Amino acid sequence: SFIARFMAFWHASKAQSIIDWDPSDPQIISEGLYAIAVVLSFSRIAYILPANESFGPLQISLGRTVKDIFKFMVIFIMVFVAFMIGMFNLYSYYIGAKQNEAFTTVEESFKTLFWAIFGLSEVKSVVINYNHKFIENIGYVLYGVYNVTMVIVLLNMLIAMINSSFQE
Amino acid sequence: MVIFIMVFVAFMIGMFNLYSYYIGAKQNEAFTTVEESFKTLFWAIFGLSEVKSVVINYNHKFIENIGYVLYGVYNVTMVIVLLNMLIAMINSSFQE
């Protein structure tokens, strides 16, 4: 980030030195990465957290639960990709039809299909401004069965198996 | 709740620091002032926040994507990890 800000300072300093909203401009790259560095540096306090009594066992169990949920994240993203390639493959020709955006490009459909895990996606994403009611229904069934299968099965897997991990 | 608000502040200062120059750009409000961004970042725990909060009326697609990744990773990490921590550890507290 500081490299980027120094580059911007050198270009601009050469500019206003000569006298006497750029899309790719490096300064927005500096403000961009500087935020991620803020998040990481704020999240580096877990090194000095464990020293205290009541916070130690908490910090210790966190890592165990994360190590437990990784191997579920594997099958999670397997199902995610399995549905996402199907949906992108289904709606790829409709780019100028459906009301709301996405479900069109790969990177743009990955979004609406990722935010359905948290319930922030809209169902109205599946409607089409043509008629073609068969493809619309196929979208409703694929999206719904995605939600049911992956969310409802994988959540109960996570909870039941993590309680299984504590009891032993 | 201690570590909960630690992560909350850790993401909130990053997001406020990211969008602070865009005050006249993004469609929907907040993610701008400290007290105003704390709101949309608090209501994401309950799912009442909108994803459309991350879009920008300029182009600058890099900063928009950084917002999507920071907000998403916030949601995943803090909600999905801290909930399973709460339930698993509270059942651990009952059984003993």
Partner: peptide, 22 residues
């Protein structure tokens, strides 16, 4: 060394917040 190191980390965070505010 622990209280000093940790404290200086906290003033690093503080300078981050005050750099962000204005």
């Amino acid at each position: 060394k622990f209280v000093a190191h940790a404290a200086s980390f906290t003033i690093f965070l503080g300078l981050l917040v005050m750099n962000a505010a204005d």
